[PDB]
Structures are given as C-alpha cells and as structure tokens.
Amino acid sequence: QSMSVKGRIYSILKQIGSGGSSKVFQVLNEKKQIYAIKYVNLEEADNQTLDSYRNEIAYLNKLQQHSDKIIRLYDYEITDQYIYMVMECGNIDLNSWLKKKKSIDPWERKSYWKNMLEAVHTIHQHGIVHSDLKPANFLIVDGMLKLIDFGIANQQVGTVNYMPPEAIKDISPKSDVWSLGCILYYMTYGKTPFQQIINQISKLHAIIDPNHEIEFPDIPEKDLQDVLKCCLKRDPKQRISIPELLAHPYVQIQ
Ligand SMILES: c1ccc2c(c1)[nH]c1cncnc12
C-alpha cells in the first residue's frame, strides 16, 4: 500500500500495532528510510478526547528537544477526520522483549533503568506525571530505551501490577517512581511484586496493605535490591525521588 503525510509519500511495510481508533504502521519514505506512522481516526471523537490528543502531541513535539530518551516526532498532519504522525521506528517494545527474552543481562538492565529514569525525569521537569507506566510504554531503539507516550491522551492495557497504592486509594511524581520500581522488579525477579495474586480485588488489597510484606530475594547486586526496596515504599512521602535515583550507587558505580 501507500500514504501521504504533508507533501511526502510513505510506502506501508507492516502494521506495527493498534488501538481503538488508532493503527501504527512501519513505513518507508521516498529516500527509502524507515519510520512509524501512527494513524488516529477522529470520526467518533469528542472535544475532551480531541483536546487530550492535541495536548499529548504538543507535549511530545516540545519535550523531544530536551531528551533523546523520548521518541522522535518528525512530522504530523491533523485534520477534523484524522491524525498522521511520522515518528521514529523502534526495534521492539520493552514488554514484548521481556516476555520473549529468558534472563536479562545485569548491564542491559542497569542501562535500561538509566534510560527510564532520564525519560520520566524529563516529563516531570515539564509538570507531567505519567501515572500509567508499564514496559509497553518503552521502546528499544538501538539498545536504547525510549518513552512512547506521556499518559495525557485518552485510552498490555488496563493492568494493575504497576499501580501505586495512592492511585488505588482514590498522584505526584512519586507515583511514576512506584511504577518504575515494578518494571525493574520484573527485570530483576522475572515477575511484578504482586503477579502471584490472580484475583484483582485481592491484588488491589495486597498493594495497599502495609502488613503485606513485599519479598526481595537476595541477588548478587545489593545496590539493585536497595533501589527496589526504595521505589516500592507504599507511603509516597517515604519513597525515593527520581533526582535521588539518578545519584544512587546502582546508576553511578562500576
Ligand atoms: C510509536 C512509534 C513507534 C512504535 C510504536 C509506537 N510502537 C512500536 C512497536 N514496535 C516497534 N516500534 C514501535
């Protein structure tokens, strides 16, 4: 097939993924370069939905200049019927990589943790708190993790495994800290902290319950265990901040 974003023509390669009203494609431009085009249908979209979309685009377009750990938005075409976004194409999303891969390299993990802190820190410096961080929000692009979205735009998906206790109780940057710790905990232990609880009502009860001790099995990396223990502190007031995580021995020491 084929498609037009501004003047430029794009040959479709495959469908990289989906959404409700959205479809993502792997494409080639006239210079035979690879990109991702996110198509969004605005046909049955309300004003609040439209505005949530316009807000997330404006933020992504802006924050691109601030960090390379944020996905590139090269161009876009917005009408009253559709949105076309020409973005950088990834190799695989972090969830699909983690699900496929057996064990993760301690260096690979440390490197990915670093990238995650850098992307989230950036959004936070611009007043953005994602609140729905999951491995699916990150993209491997040449051994580099990139943040896919900001959580602003309406609508794995629906998962409560990375949900902070305060979000269940009903939201500060500390909420994203909890969710990041759940991601690192998965990369460390091969499961999210409350993954063994099937029942969603029982799972939500465990997360909020302080008498429910989160287990941190002894790994050779004492620095990595401390990060996990720091991130996964139920009281947001007792939880480590992102600027504090960037100065932690796990990130800084050889
Ligand atoms: C936006 C831009 C690029 C991608 C995306 C969403 N999902 C993906 C999944 N796998 C690879 N690349 C991408």
PDB file of C-alpha atoms and ligand atoms in Angstrom:
ATOM      1  CA  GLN A   1       0.000   0.000   0.000  1.00  0.00           C
ATOM      2  CA  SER A   2       0.897   3.798   0.268  1.00  0.00           C
ATOM      3  CA  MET A   3       0.030   7.112   2.138  1.00  0.00           C
ATOM      4  CA  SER A   4       0.630  10.906   2.240  1.00  0.00           C
ATOM      5  CA  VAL A   5       1.762  12.864   5.359  1.00  0.00           C
ATOM      6  CA  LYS A   6       2.160  16.537   4.259  1.00  0.00           C
ATOM      7  CA  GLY A   7       3.867  16.507   0.824  1.00  0.00           C
ATOM      8  CA  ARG A   8       5.840  13.284   1.474  1.00  0.00           C
ATOM      9  CA  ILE A   9       4.777   9.793   0.327  1.00  0.00           C
ATOM     10  CA  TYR A  10       5.100   6.672   2.544  1.00  0.00           C
ATOM     11  CA  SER A  11       5.062   3.044   1.433  1.00  0.00           C
ATOM     12  CA  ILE A  12       3.485   0.768   4.154  1.00  0.00           C
ATOM     13  CA  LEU A  13       5.693  -2.233   5.236  1.00  0.00           C
ATOM     14  CA  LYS A  14       3.551  -3.805   8.045  1.00  0.00           C
ATOM     15  CA  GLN A  15       1.146  -2.919  10.883  1.00  0.00           C
ATOM     16  CA  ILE A  16       3.363  -2.366  13.972  1.00  0.00           C
ATOM     17  CA  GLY A  17       0.378  -2.350  16.368  1.00  0.00           C
ATOM     18  CA  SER A  18      -3.061  -0.975  17.146  1.00  0.00           C
ATOM     19  CA  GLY A  19      -5.544   0.996  19.313  1.00  0.00           C
ATOM     20  CA  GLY A  20      -9.289   1.595  19.275  1.00  0.00           C
ATOM     21  CA  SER A  21      -9.440   4.350  16.645  1.00  0.00           C
ATOM     22  CA  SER A  22      -5.623   4.106  16.090  1.00  0.00           C
ATOM     23  CA  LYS A  23      -3.349   1.920  13.922  1.00  0.00           C
ATOM     24  CA  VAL A  24       0.509   2.096  13.845  1.00  0.00           C
ATOM     25  CA  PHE A  25       2.452   1.150  10.644  1.00  0.00           C
ATOM     26  CA  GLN A  26       6.054   0.512   9.689  1.00  0.00           C
ATOM     27  CA  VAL A  27       6.704   2.693   6.583  1.00  0.00           C
ATOM     28  CA  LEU A  28       9.398   3.787   4.032  1.00  0.00           C
ATOM     29  CA  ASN A  29       9.701   7.374   2.700  1.00  0.00           C
ATOM     30  CA  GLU A  30      10.845   8.391  -0.850  1.00  0.00           C
ATOM     31  CA  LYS A  31      14.546   8.279   0.346  1.00  0.00           C
ATOM     32  CA  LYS A  32      13.896   4.581   1.386  1.00  0.00           C
ATOM     33  CA  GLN A  33      14.199   5.397   5.168  1.00  0.00           C
ATOM     34  CA  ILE A  34      12.183   3.548   7.840  1.00  0.00           C
ATOM     35  CA  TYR A  35       9.613   5.274  10.115  1.00  0.00           C
ATOM     36  CA  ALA A  36       6.429   4.548  12.107  1.00  0.00           C
ATOM     37  CA  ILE A  37       3.186   6.225  11.213  1.00  0.00           C
ATOM     38  CA  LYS A  38       0.536   6.406  13.850  1.00  0.00           C
ATOM     39  CA  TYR A  39      -2.901   6.849  12.247  1.00  0.00           C
ATOM     40  CA  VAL A  40      -5.757   8.065  14.549  1.00  0.00           C
ATOM     41  CA  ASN A  41      -9.372   8.261  13.382  1.00  0.00           C
ATOM     42  CA  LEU A  42     -11.170  11.334  14.859  1.00  0.00           C
ATOM     43  CA  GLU A  43     -14.645  10.376  13.382  1.00  0.00           C
ATOM     44  CA  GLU A  44     -16.286   9.394  16.712  1.00  0.00           C
ATOM     45  CA  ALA A  45     -14.028  11.645  18.962  1.00  0.00           C
ATOM     46  CA  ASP A  46     -15.463  14.166  21.487  1.00  0.00           C
ATOM     47  CA  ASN A  47     -13.972  17.618  22.257  1.00  0.00           C
ATOM     48  CA  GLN A  48     -12.370  16.380  25.525  1.00  0.00           C
ATOM     49  CA  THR A  49     -10.805  13.396  23.620  1.00  0.00           C
ATOM     50  CA  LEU A  50      -9.630  15.756  20.812  1.00  0.00           C
ATOM     51  CA  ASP A  51      -8.074  18.064  23.361  1.00  0.00           C
ATOM     52  CA  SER A  52      -6.353  15.192  25.223  1.00  0.00           C
ATOM     53  CA  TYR A  53      -4.831  14.179  21.795  1.00  0.00           C
ATOM     54  CA  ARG A  54      -3.759  17.770  20.882  1.00  0.00           C
ATOM     55  CA  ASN A  55      -2.210  18.151  24.358  1.00  0.00           C
ATOM     56  CA  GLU A  56      -0.157  14.917  24.173  1.00  0.00           C
ATOM     57  CA  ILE A  57       1.060  15.832  20.606  1.00  0.00           C
ATOM     58  CA  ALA A  58       2.117  19.412  21.730  1.00  0.00           C
ATOM     59  CA  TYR A  59       3.967  17.946  24.732  1.00  0.00           C
ATOM     60  CA  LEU A  60       5.723  15.227  22.650  1.00  0.00           C
ATOM     61  CA  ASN A  61       6.696  17.740  19.958  1.00  0.00           C
ATOM     62  CA  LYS A  62       8.167  20.067  22.745  1.00  0.00           C
ATOM     63  CA  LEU A  63       9.934  17.520  25.040  1.00  0.00           C
ATOM     64  CA  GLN A  64      11.762  15.992  22.001  1.00  0.00           C
ATOM     65  CA  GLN A  65      14.302  18.856  22.182  1.00  0.00           C
ATOM     66  CA  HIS A  66      15.037  18.026  25.924  1.00  0.00           C
ATOM     67  CA  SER A  67      15.966  14.317  25.754  1.00  0.00           C
ATOM     68  CA  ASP A  68      16.948  11.607  23.313  1.00  0.00           C
ATOM     69  CA  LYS A  69      15.134   9.062  25.642  1.00  0.00           C
ATOM     70  CA  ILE A  70      11.849  10.485  24.276  1.00  0.00           C
ATOM     71  CA  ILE A  71      10.585   9.104  20.893  1.00  0.00           C
ATOM     72  CA  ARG A  72      11.203  11.314  17.790  1.00  0.00           C
ATOM     73  CA  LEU A  73       8.164  13.020  16.223  1.00  0.00           C
ATOM     74  CA  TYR A  74       9.368  14.064  12.742  1.00  0.00           C
ATOM     75  CA  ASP A  75       6.105  15.416  11.275  1.00  0.00           C
ATOM     76  CA  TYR A  76       2.306  15.267  11.611  1.00  0.00           C
ATOM     77  CA  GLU A  77      -0.888  16.012   9.640  1.00  0.00           C
ATOM     78  CA  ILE A  78      -4.049  16.899  11.712  1.00  0.00           C
ATOM     79  CA  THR A  79      -7.484  17.313  10.180  1.00  0.00           C
ATOM     80  CA  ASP A  80     -11.033  17.000  11.586  1.00  0.00           C
ATOM     81  CA  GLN A  81     -11.235  13.321  10.435  1.00  0.00           C
ATOM     82  CA  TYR A  82      -7.684  12.036  11.154  1.00  0.00           C
ATOM     83  CA  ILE A  83      -4.188  12.411  12.656  1.00  0.00           C
ATOM     84  CA  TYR A  84      -0.999  11.083  10.961  1.00  0.00           C
ATOM     85  CA  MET A  85       2.221  11.119  12.989  1.00  0.00           C
ATOM     86  CA  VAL A  86       5.643  10.373  11.406  1.00  0.00           C
ATOM     87  CA  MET A  87       7.752   9.062  14.264  1.00  0.00           C
ATOM     88  CA  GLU A  88      10.955   7.058  14.804  1.00  0.00           C
ATOM     89  CA  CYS A  89      10.533   3.298  14.432  1.00  0.00           C
ATOM     90  CA  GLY A  90      11.642   1.049  17.271  1.00  0.00           C
ATOM     91  CA  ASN A  91      13.047  -2.458  17.223  1.00  0.00           C
ATOM     92  CA  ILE A  92      10.553  -3.907  19.815  1.00  0.00           C
ATOM     93  CA  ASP A  93       8.592  -2.589  22.830  1.00  0.00           C
ATOM     94  CA  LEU A  94      10.053  -3.442  26.262  1.00  0.00           C
ATOM     95  CA  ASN A  95       7.129  -5.736  27.298  1.00  0.00           C
ATOM     96  CA  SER A  96       7.437  -7.975  24.147  1.00  0.00           C
ATOM     97  CA  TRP A  97      11.236  -8.020  24.609  1.00  0.00           C
ATOM     98  CA  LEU A  98      10.959  -9.053  28.329  1.00  0.00           C
ATOM     99  CA  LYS A  99       8.215 -11.665  27.623  1.00  0.00           C
ATOM    100  CA  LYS A 100      10.343 -13.177  24.712  1.00  0.00           C
ATOM    101  CA  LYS A 101      13.823 -12.958  26.411  1.00  0.00           C
ATOM    102  CA  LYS A 102      14.727 -15.615  29.061  1.00  0.00           C
ATOM    103  CA  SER A 103      17.182 -13.980  31.582  1.00  0.00           C
ATOM    104  CA  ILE A 104      18.266 -10.278  31.331  1.00  0.00           C
ATOM    105  CA  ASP A 105      21.945  -9.143  31.414  1.00  0.00           C
ATOM    106  CA  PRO A 106      22.760  -7.053  34.566  1.00  0.00           C
ATOM    107  CA  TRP A 107      24.472  -4.467  32.335  1.00  0.00           C
ATOM    108  CA  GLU A 108      21.462  -4.411  29.879  1.00  0.00           C
ATOM    109  CA  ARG A 109      19.126  -3.901  32.891  1.00  0.00           C
ATOM    110  CA  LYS A 110      21.307  -1.132  34.503  1.00  0.00           C
ATOM    111  CA  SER A 111      21.443   0.621  31.067  1.00  0.00           C
ATOM    112  CA  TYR A 112      17.629   0.339  30.588  1.00  0.00           C
ATOM    113  CA  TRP A 113      16.990   1.598  34.162  1.00  0.00           C
ATOM    114  CA  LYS A 114      19.174   4.649  33.407  1.00  0.00           C
ATOM    115  CA  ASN A 115      17.160   5.435  30.191  1.00  0.00           C
ATOM    116  CA  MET A 116      13.820   5.038  32.084  1.00  0.00           C
ATOM    117  CA  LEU A 117      14.937   7.491  34.829  1.00  0.00           C
ATOM    118  CA  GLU A 118      16.074  10.037  32.111  1.00  0.00           C
ATOM    119  CA  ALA A 119      12.753   9.902  30.073  1.00  0.00           C
ATOM    120  CA  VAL A 120      10.482  10.122  33.221  1.00  0.00           C
ATOM    121  CA  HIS A 121      12.678  12.838  34.814  1.00  0.00           C
ATOM    122  CA  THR A 122      12.219  14.964  31.601  1.00  0.00           C
ATOM    123  CA  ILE A 123       8.375  14.740  31.647  1.00  0.00           C
ATOM    124  CA  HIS A 124       8.421  15.636  35.405  1.00  0.00           C
ATOM    125  CA  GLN A 125      10.547  18.757  34.748  1.00  0.00           C
ATOM    126  CA  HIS A 126       7.661  19.964  32.451  1.00  0.00           C
ATOM    127  CA  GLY A 127       4.929  19.191  35.031  1.00  0.00           C
ATOM    128  CA  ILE A 128       3.953  15.805  33.508  1.00  0.00           C
ATOM    129  CA  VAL A 129       3.244  12.739  35.771  1.00  0.00           C
ATOM    130  CA  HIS A 130       2.530   9.721  33.537  1.00  0.00           C
ATOM    131  CA  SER A 131       0.645   7.650  36.204  1.00  0.00           C
ATOM    132  CA  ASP A 132       0.277   4.599  33.897  1.00  0.00           C
ATOM    133  CA  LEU A 133       3.864   3.385  33.396  1.00  0.00           C
ATOM    134  CA  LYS A 134       4.311  -0.188  32.112  1.00  0.00           C
ATOM    135  CA  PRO A 135       7.022  -1.932  29.996  1.00  0.00           C
ATOM    136  CA  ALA A 136       4.663  -1.410  26.961  1.00  0.00           C
ATOM    137  CA  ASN A 137       5.343   2.427  27.175  1.00  0.00           C
ATOM    138  CA  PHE A 138       9.044   1.927  26.415  1.00  0.00           C
ATOM    139  CA  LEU A 139      10.678   1.140  23.083  1.00  0.00           C
ATOM    140  CA  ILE A 140      14.076  -0.416  22.327  1.00  0.00           C
ATOM    141  CA  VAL A 141      15.779   1.672  19.606  1.00  0.00           C
ATOM    142  CA  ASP A 142      19.407   0.636  19.013  1.00  0.00           C
ATOM    143  CA  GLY A 143      19.975  -0.620  22.586  1.00  0.00           C
ATOM    144  CA  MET A 144      18.317   2.493  23.969  1.00  0.00           C
ATOM    145  CA  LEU A 145      15.016   2.700  25.788  1.00  0.00           C
ATOM    146  CA  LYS A 146      12.637   5.458  24.623  1.00  0.00           C
ATOM    147  CA  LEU A 147       9.392   6.688  26.270  1.00  0.00           C
ATOM    148  CA  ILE A 148       6.471   6.186  23.791  1.00  0.00           C
ATOM    149  CA  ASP A 149       3.817   8.390  25.470  1.00  0.00           C
ATOM    150  CA  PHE A 150       3.033  10.792  28.318  1.00  0.00           C
ATOM    151  CA  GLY A 151      -0.290   9.373  29.550  1.00  0.00           C
ATOM    152  CA  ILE A 152      -2.170  12.612  28.609  1.00  0.00           C
ATOM    153  CA  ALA A 153      -4.177  11.248  25.556  1.00  0.00           C
ATOM    154  CA  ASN A 154      -7.434   9.322  26.324  1.00  0.00           C
ATOM    155  CA  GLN A 155      -7.361   5.429  26.417  1.00  0.00           C
ATOM    156  CA  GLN A 156      -0.715  -4.581  27.643  1.00  0.00           C
ATOM    157  CA  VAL A 157      -3.587  -2.166  28.711  1.00  0.00           C
ATOM    158  CA  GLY A 158      -5.704  -1.992  31.877  1.00  0.00           C
ATOM    159  CA  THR A 159      -3.065  -3.867  34.046  1.00  0.00           C
ATOM    160  CA  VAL A 160      -2.931  -3.102  37.843  1.00  0.00           C
ATOM    161  CA  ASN A 161       0.529  -4.717  38.523  1.00  0.00           C
ATOM    162  CA  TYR A 162       2.383  -1.362  38.195  1.00  0.00           C
ATOM    163  CA  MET A 163      -0.306   0.664  40.008  1.00  0.00           C
ATOM    164  CA  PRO A 164       0.893   2.711  43.042  1.00  0.00           C
ATOM    165  CA  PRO A 165      -1.012   2.399  46.392  1.00  0.00           C
ATOM    166  CA  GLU A 166      -2.141   6.099  46.252  1.00  0.00           C
ATOM    167  CA  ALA A 167      -3.749   5.605  42.768  1.00  0.00           C
ATOM    168  CA  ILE A 168      -5.754   2.631  44.186  1.00  0.00           C
ATOM    169  CA  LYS A 169      -6.754   4.695  47.321  1.00  0.00           C
ATOM    170  CA  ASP A 170      -8.610   7.240  45.011  1.00  0.00           C
ATOM    171  CA  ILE A 171      -0.859  11.408  42.258  1.00  0.00           C
ATOM    172  CA  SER A 172       2.610  13.105  42.406  1.00  0.00           C
ATOM    173  CA  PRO A 173       5.948  12.231  40.543  1.00  0.00           C
ATOM    174  CA  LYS A 174       6.419   9.572  43.284  1.00  0.00           C
ATOM    175  CA  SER A 175       3.554   7.596  41.558  1.00  0.00           C
ATOM    176  CA  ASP A 176       5.794   7.107  38.476  1.00  0.00           C
ATOM    177  CA  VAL A 177       8.619   6.034  40.896  1.00  0.00           C
ATOM    178  CA  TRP A 178       6.466   3.108  42.163  1.00  0.00           C
ATOM    179  CA  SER A 179       5.621   2.049  38.562  1.00  0.00           C
ATOM    180  CA  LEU A 180       9.325   2.211  37.524  1.00  0.00           C
ATOM    181  CA  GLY A 181      10.258   0.018  40.557  1.00  0.00           C
ATOM    182  CA  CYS A 182       7.650  -2.564  39.437  1.00  0.00           C
ATOM    183  CA  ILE A 183       9.357  -2.562  35.959  1.00  0.00           C
ATOM    184  CA  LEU A 184      12.847  -3.014  37.475  1.00  0.00           C
ATOM    185  CA  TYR A 185      11.451  -5.647  39.904  1.00  0.00           C
ATOM    186  CA  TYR A 186      10.171  -7.608  36.847  1.00  0.00           C
ATOM    187  CA  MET A 187      13.644  -7.238  35.128  1.00  0.00           C
ATOM    188  CA  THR A 188      15.259  -8.460  38.416  1.00  0.00           C
ATOM    189  CA  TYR A 189      12.904 -11.205  39.667  1.00  0.00           C
ATOM    190  CA  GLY A 190      11.124 -12.250  36.426  1.00  0.00           C
ATOM    191  CA  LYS A 191       7.694 -11.207  37.851  1.00  0.00           C
ATOM    192  CA  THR A 192       5.995  -7.992  39.138  1.00  0.00           C
ATOM    193  CA  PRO A 193       5.710  -7.811  43.003  1.00  0.00           C
ATOM    194  CA  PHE A 194       2.004  -8.891  43.201  1.00  0.00           C
ATOM    195  CA  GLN A 195       1.946 -11.060  39.976  1.00  0.00           C
ATOM    196  CA  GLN A 196       1.225 -14.251  42.027  1.00  0.00           C
ATOM    197  CA  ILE A 197      -2.200 -12.838  43.084  1.00  0.00           C
ATOM    198  CA  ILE A 198      -4.746 -13.871  40.404  1.00  0.00           C
ATOM    199  CA  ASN A 199      -7.889 -12.189  41.923  1.00  0.00           C
ATOM    200  CA  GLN A 200      -7.842  -8.445  41.048  1.00  0.00           C
ATOM    201  CA  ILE A 201      -9.780  -7.397  44.206  1.00  0.00           C
ATOM    202  CA  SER A 202      -7.281  -9.446  46.335  1.00  0.00           C
ATOM    203  CA  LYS A 203      -4.337  -7.999  44.292  1.00  0.00           C
ATOM    204  CA  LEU A 204      -5.512  -4.349  44.863  1.00  0.00           C
ATOM    205  CA  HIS A 205      -5.933  -5.159  48.582  1.00  0.00           C
ATOM    206  CA  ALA A 206      -2.332  -6.508  48.795  1.00  0.00           C
ATOM    207  CA  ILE A 207      -0.754  -3.413  47.127  1.00  0.00           C
ATOM    208  CA  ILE A 208      -2.403  -1.026  49.616  1.00  0.00           C
ATOM    209  CA  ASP A 209      -1.914  -3.372  52.631  1.00  0.00           C
ATOM    210  CA  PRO A 210       1.232  -2.413  54.674  1.00  0.00           C
ATOM    211  CA  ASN A 211       1.094  -5.679  56.639  1.00  0.00           C
ATOM    212  CA  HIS A 212       1.624  -7.385  53.222  1.00  0.00           C
ATOM    213  CA  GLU A 213       5.433  -7.660  53.070  1.00  0.00           C
ATOM    214  CA  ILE A 214       6.872  -7.432  49.507  1.00  0.00           C
ATOM    215  CA  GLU A 215       9.600 -10.109  49.211  1.00  0.00           C
ATOM    216  CA  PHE A 216      13.035  -9.046  47.961  1.00  0.00           C
ATOM    217  CA  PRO A 217      15.095 -12.290  47.422  1.00  0.00           C
ATOM    218  CA  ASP A 218      18.891 -11.851  47.841  1.00  0.00           C
ATOM    219  CA  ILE A 219      20.571 -11.204  44.474  1.00  0.00           C
ATOM    220  CA  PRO A 220      24.373 -10.575  43.997  1.00  0.00           C
ATOM    221  CA  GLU A 221      23.535  -6.896  43.363  1.00  0.00           C
ATOM    222  CA  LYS A 222      22.970  -5.345  46.844  1.00  0.00           C
ATOM    223  CA  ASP A 223      22.674  -1.830  45.151  1.00  0.00           C
ATOM    224  CA  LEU A 224      19.799  -3.163  42.917  1.00  0.00           C
ATOM    225  CA  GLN A 225      17.970  -4.673  45.936  1.00  0.00           C
ATOM    226  CA  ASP A 226      18.129  -1.272  47.766  1.00  0.00           C
ATOM    227  CA  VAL A 227      16.697   0.595  44.691  1.00  0.00           C
ATOM    228  CA  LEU A 228      13.731  -1.862  44.631  1.00  0.00           C
ATOM    229  CA  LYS A 229      13.158  -1.541  48.395  1.00  0.00           C
ATOM    230  CA  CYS A 230      13.319   2.356  47.957  1.00  0.00           C
ATOM    231  CA  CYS A 231      10.943   2.556  44.947  1.00  0.00           C
ATOM    232  CA  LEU A 232       8.418   0.100  46.382  1.00  0.00           C
ATOM    233  CA  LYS A 233       7.699   2.092  49.603  1.00  0.00           C
ATOM    234  CA  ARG A 234       3.857   2.279  49.970  1.00  0.00           C
ATOM    235  CA  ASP A 235       3.888   5.827  51.534  1.00  0.00           C
ATOM    236  CA  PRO A 236       4.723   8.316  48.715  1.00  0.00           C
ATOM    237  CA  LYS A 237       6.317  10.577  51.391  1.00  0.00           C
ATOM    238  CA  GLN A 238       8.769   7.712  52.279  1.00  0.00           C
ATOM    239  CA  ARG A 239       9.516   6.890  48.591  1.00  0.00           C
ATOM    240  CA  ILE A 240      12.774   7.856  46.819  1.00  0.00           C
ATOM    241  CA  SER A 241      12.544  10.684  44.208  1.00  0.00           C
ATOM    242  CA  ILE A 242      13.833  10.498  40.545  1.00  0.00           C
ATOM    243  CA  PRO A 243      16.643  13.087  41.248  1.00  0.00           C
ATOM    244  CA  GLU A 244      17.616  10.803  44.207  1.00  0.00           C
ATOM    245  CA  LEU A 245      17.514   7.685  41.980  1.00  0.00           C
ATOM    246  CA  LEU A 246      19.931   9.340  39.470  1.00  0.00           C
ATOM    247  CA  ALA A 247      22.529   9.770  42.290  1.00  0.00           C
ATOM    248  CA  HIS A 248      22.100   6.187  43.669  1.00  0.00           C
ATOM    249  CA  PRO A 249      25.140   3.751  43.543  1.00  0.00           C
ATOM    250  CA  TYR A 250      23.181   1.375  41.241  1.00  0.00           C
ATOM    251  CA  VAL A 251      23.203   4.043  38.454  1.00  0.00           C
ATOM    252  CA  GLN A 252      26.644   5.659  39.256  1.00  0.00           C
ATOM    253  CA  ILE A 253      29.058   2.955  40.483  1.00  0.00           C
ATOM    254  CA  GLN A 254      31.001   0.423  38.275  1.00  0.00           C
TER     255      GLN A 254
HETATM  256  C1  LIG B   1       5.049   4.663  18.043  1.00  0.00           C
HETATM  257  C2  LIG B   1       6.261   4.708  17.359  1.00  0.00           C
HETATM  258  C3  LIG B   1       6.987   3.550  17.122  1.00  0.00           C
HETATM  259  C4  LIG B   1       6.499   2.325  17.575  1.00  0.00           C
HETATM  260  C5  LIG B   1       5.275   2.295  18.281  1.00  0.00           C
HETATM  261  C6  LIG B   1       4.540   3.459  18.509  1.00  0.00           C
HETATM  262  N1  LIG B   1       5.026   1.005  18.712  1.00  0.00           N
HETATM  263  C7  LIG B   1       6.066   0.192  18.299  1.00  0.00           C
HETATM  264  C8  LIG B   1       6.284  -1.178  18.492  1.00  0.00           C
HETATM  265  N2  LIG B   1       7.359  -1.786  17.967  1.00  0.00           N
HETATM  266  C9  LIG B   1       8.198  -1.011  17.278  1.00  0.00           C
HETATM  267  N3  LIG B   1       8.110   0.308  17.046  1.00  0.00           N
HETATM  268  C10 LIG B   1       7.043   0.964  17.542  1.00  0.00           C
END
